[PDB]
Every structure is written in C-alpha cells, then in structure tokens.
Amino acid sequence: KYALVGDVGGTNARLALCDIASGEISQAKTYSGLDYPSLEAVIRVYLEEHKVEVKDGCIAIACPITGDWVAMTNHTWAFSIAEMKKNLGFSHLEIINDFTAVSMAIPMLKKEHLIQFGGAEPVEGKPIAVYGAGTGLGVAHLVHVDKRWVSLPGEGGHVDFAPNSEEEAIILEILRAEIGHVSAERVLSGPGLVNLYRAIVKADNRLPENLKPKDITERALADSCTDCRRALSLFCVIMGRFGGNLALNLGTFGGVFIAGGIVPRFLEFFKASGFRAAFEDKGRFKEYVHDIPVYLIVHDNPGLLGSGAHLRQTLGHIL
Amino acid sequence: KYALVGDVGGTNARLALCDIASGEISQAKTYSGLDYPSLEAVIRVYLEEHKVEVKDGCIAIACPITGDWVAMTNHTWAFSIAEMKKNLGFSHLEIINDFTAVSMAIPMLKKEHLIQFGGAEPVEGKPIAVYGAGTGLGVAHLVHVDKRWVSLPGEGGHVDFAPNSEEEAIILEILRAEIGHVSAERVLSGPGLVNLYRAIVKADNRLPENLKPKDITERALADSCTDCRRALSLFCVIMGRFGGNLALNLGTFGGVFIAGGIVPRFLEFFKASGFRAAFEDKGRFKEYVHDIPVYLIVHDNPGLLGSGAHLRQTLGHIL
Ligand SMILES: OC[C@H]1O[C@@H](O)[C@H](O)[C@@H](O)[C@@H]1O
Ligand SMILES: OC[C@H]1O[C@@H](O)[C@H](O)[C@@H](O)[C@@H]1O
C-alpha cells in the first residue's frame, strides 16, 4: 500500500510515505544529517515512528549516481546501494539523482503548481528540460517514449559558464583567477549568488563583505546596496541564458522547467527581471525558442513526488 | 525492395538507394542544388537515371525540421513535406535534420569506421552525444530505449560560445562586436575557422587577409602562417571543451561521436592537439568525463546510412 520516498540534500534528509495506488505523498518529515551517522539509520527511525511496514523504496540524493557506491560531495555519508537494500530487507530500492526525481514529478503536477514565464504552449511528445539553482545547479531532461516517461540524468550544472556580455565576461575573469575552471554552478546557485556579489565588488577594486546568500537578496530587494542589486539582476539574466541553451540543445518544445530553489524567495523581482529576454537572446535562433514555455515549479516537494512516480513506473504503473 | 535516402546540405544534394532488408547503401550520386529548381526535381531526375521503382524515402537536410514547411536558409529551395510526398506518390516520406540521420548511423557503424580519441569503453544503454563541425555545427543525441533507438534532434550548435581561457575570451570579445550573440557555430565550423583566424589577427592590431577555410588548414599544416596554425590549434581545443559539455549535460557514458566535416583534412594535427585535455578540463568533474570515449566517424556517407536506419526503424524493422 505504502512505499518509502526520500529527498536527501547535504545536511537535510526528508522522508515520506507514498500511496502505491495513487502516488499521493503523506507523512513528510525532515531530519538533520548531522544528528545521524548514516542514511540507513535515518530510515530505521522513520519506519518505526510511523508504524508502517514498507518493502519498496526510492530515495533521491543530490550527487552523481553512477554505480553501486554513492559518496556525497557535500555530506560525509557514503554507502552501497545493494547492501542497504539487503540490510533494510527491501524488495526494490531505487537510488536516483535529485533532479532525476524532480524531472519525474512533472507528469504529476497540476496547473496550480506552475507559474509561466513567457512562451506559448508545450508541444506534446517533445522533450522537456529541468534545472534549478539551489545548493548547486541540477539539470535533467525528460522524454516520453510510447507509454513510459524516461528521465535523462546528468551533471549539466558543471558545464563551462558561457558569458555573453562584457559584464558577464568580467565575472569569468575574476572567478577564473581563483579556481581555474568556472562552471555554471559557480554563478547559478546559492553560493553562486555570493560569487556574483564578490566579483562585482572585486572588479571595483574593493573587498567584499562576508555576505550569505539570503543577505544578498534582502539587500537587493531593499535597494540598500547596489553591489547586491547588480548581483541579483545578473543572476536572473544568467538564469535565462542557461535555460535557453538547454532548450536549443535538446529541442525541448515540451517546455523548460525551473525547480524552485532560491528563486521563489525573490519571486516578484524575478518576474520583473530580464530573465525572459536573456532566454531568447540567441541570434538567428530567437524565433526557435520564442514560443517554448518556461515554468517555475512552486510545488513544495517535487523531489518526494517524483521519487514516488519513478518507483511506481518502475513497479509497472502507468503515469 | 529499395527506398530512397538523401543527405542535402548547402549547395549539394546526395541521393542514394537503400536495401530495405539489409540497410545497405548503393548507387549514390552527388547532384548540385544550383542546377535544379527544387529537391523534387532532383528526386525525379535521380529516380529515372537509375530506373528503380521507389515508394518510401528519407531525406536528411541541414536545417531545423519543425513543421511541414521546410526552408533551408543555406539554399534557395523551400518546400512543404506533405506537398512533396503527394507529388511523388510516396507512402512514407521522412524528412529529418542532418544530424538526426548521422545519429542513427551509429548503430550501423563498424569498428573500421571509428577512430578513438581517449576514454576507455562505452556503457550499454547509456545516452550518446553526436556533433560535427562542417558548414554549420550539428548536434544530436541518441538513447536506446527497449528495442528502439530514439534520436533526440536539436539545434545545439547555436548555444552560446563558452570561452574558458584568456585567449578564448578575446575571441568572444571581438566577435561580439561584429555579430552580437556569438554561437559555438561561429568558431566551430568551416566559417568559424575564418572567424578564429580573423579575431586573432585583429587582436594583434593588424588587418586580416581574405582567406578561406581551405587556406587556413593548409597554411597551418605547412607552418606558413603562425596566425593560421594558432587558429587551428584553438579550433581543436574548443572542439574538446564543447564535446565535454555535451557529455556532462546528458551523462553520455555511451560515448561522444564526432562526425568529420573538416577534421579529417587535418587528422594528424588533431591527434596531436590538446583536444582530449580540453575535453576533460572540467574542474572537479574531470574524473566524471575521464573514462568517456570519443570517436571520430571516418565513414564517408553517415547521413545516407543513418537515413536508411531511420526509415527502416519507422517501417517496423529492428536495428
Ligand atoms: O543538487 C543539484 C545538483 O547540484 C550538483 O552539484 C550535483 O552534482 C548534482 O548531482 C545535483 O543534482
Ligand atoms: O549541419 C549541421 C547543423 O548546422 C546548423 O547551422 C543548422 O541550424 C542545423 O540544423 C544543422 O544540423
């Protein structure tokens, strides 16, 4: 009747139960990864606090899933998938990338979970691209073949940052002299927002403050600091440029989806930003992406919802 | 018994016959688009010099294939797919992008048709990335779902150029002044070799010669112009960076394939260039792409071969 679903990112692990018949998510609880020694220990606690027998599960984790060994870059947890499934006695245990799960949540979303940013209307049967600026920059794609939804994972957040304008080029130069390779995550993320502010200040021959991401948005929203105001606007433009590159690359006439990370915290600024202009700023191919819609997912837990969908399809349910 | 396959790009129009039972290609001929008023005229002309009755066809064309109206924009022809099919009395007439066709040639290629550049071995069932620098920059992706090879076409050659080094950033700066948005096609193509040469010369505060892509390649191999050898060396580096971004974005552990448009004319220079190092210069995710193989396709007619593969799969045959 019920299956276990999870969304683990860095220091937070979120666990919930999923209705096998319908895919509804219920009984969601967030745990702290610092207070538990392993992912397995957290699952043991959840399964007894809720008095539910569970035999199938699917956990989303924010790191590359390649083989049986899962080592978290942000967290210290590391485990073998086949051993956890045996240890917990599960019949199915699916370990997937966090944006693999987010991509799988799209067929479950209603119109009330989306806010459109330009474009006209999706083309049925054409690919879909998903990305989000959160702890890092996650990217995934989704294609419908026959009756199966096929998620295409990857590490698209670590491709080379692609500056277009002179302002964007100046950011690359300051970041390049610090770390070498500058990936898109270094600018399109929570820490990326800090990098934008630091480089904009360093370019003015000044030392940046030790500002946290939430500080930069709040000062930019209050217009109390021009360095932060510039950073936030530059972030919104780079967001559109990244998404427009994805849409061209995979011909995603099914739409481009933004899994809400830090963006919903400055949603009104985002709507008035230059995001949509940057999305279409593609030379002779502005008209190619002009009608492709863009959606922000305001669902409070797409990762849990899409973990259940991925499992149910794996178990033979048609979404 | 036979079906018609075609590969049309720019000025040329290549037509051939395809064995429906086997997928073998034969009786290929290269017509000129300047000497005929339409692609229909070429097909009508070809179908009578070879005296073969044909009902099914697949033509690959180097332009985006969005709807029924097809306009090349690299040629004067433009036509409706539905209208051309009716005129020829075909039952099936598939019209596809030229790198959709190249992507479907991959299942039919043998070891003799591949040259490996680094990486170790492909993982079965993982996505494949295909790209090629010719008159334009083509990109396609290929995934094997159940029994079917699914081609994901796109216009990925028109994404933003992504400079990494200081020398690359200069190229973007100079080209941005001349054309505005700078696509990867502007540096990674036949014409892009000239842009790389010209930006290098203008960066040196000199005036560029009116060279052609043939001039740059031959002068580079002859050590006749240091401007032209630098342009060629930077071409090979950016080729590697671009391919590495493709492998990160879609997790292409099935391999990255480079369709040779201009590469084979300087094959040995390419082998000695910094292509592989550029392919893997991806910060923390060098190890992620380190083992992914890169193959150069040395088949002289992959577009015809893949067009047959696409039509055959559409007709119900298994590849
Ligand atoms: O969490 C979003 C993304 O951040 C990146 O740093 C990770 O490598 C991805 O696996 C993850 O999907
Ligand atoms: O020929 C390779 C590529 O060149 C580009 O200019 C075209 O827009 C693509 O449709 C084509 O696939």
Numbering used by the authors:
A (entry chain B), B (entry chain A): 3 to 321
Copy out sentences from the published article reporting this entry, exactly as the authors wrote them.
Glucokinase (GLK) catalyzes the first reaction in the glycolytic pathway and is a target for regulation in a wide range of organisms. This work presents the structure of apo ecGLK bound with phosphate and the structure of ecGLK in complex with both glucose and phosphate, implying a role for phosphate in regulation of the GLK activity. In the ternary complex, phosphate is bound adjacent to glucose, and the B factors for the α4, α5 and α9 helices were further reduced, while r.m.s.d. spikes were observed at the end of the β10 sheet and within the α6 helix of the β-domain. This structural characterization suggests that phosphate could influence the activity of GLK by altering glucose binding and modulating interactions with a loop-interacting regulatory protein.
A ternary complex consisting of GLK, glucose and phosphate is also reported in this work. The crystals of the phosphate-bound glucose–ecGLK complex were obtained by soaking ecGLK with 5 mM glucose and were grown in 100 mM bis-Tris pH 6.5, 200 mM magnesium chloride, 25%(w/v) PEG 3350. The crystal structure was determined by molecular replacement and refined to an R factor of 0.2034 (Rfree = 0.2580) at a resolution of 2.54 Å. The small and large domains retain the α-helices and β-sheets found in phosphate-bound ecGLK while there are domain shifts to account for the glucose binding. The small domain shifts down, closing the binding cleft, and the large domain maintains its relative position with slight shifts into the center of ecGLK. The phosphate-bound glucose–ecGLK complex crystallizes in a more highly ordered space group (P212121) compared with the phosphate-free form (P1211), suggesting that phosphate binding stabilizes the conformation of ecGLK. The phosphate binding stabilizes Arg286 and forms hydrogen bonds to the O2 and O4 of phosphate in chain B. This process reinforces the enzyme structure, lowers its flexibility and may improve glucose binding. In the phosphate-free structure, the O atom of Glu187 forms hydrogen bonds to both glucose and water, while in the phosphate-bound complex it forms a new hydrogen bond to Arg286 NH2.
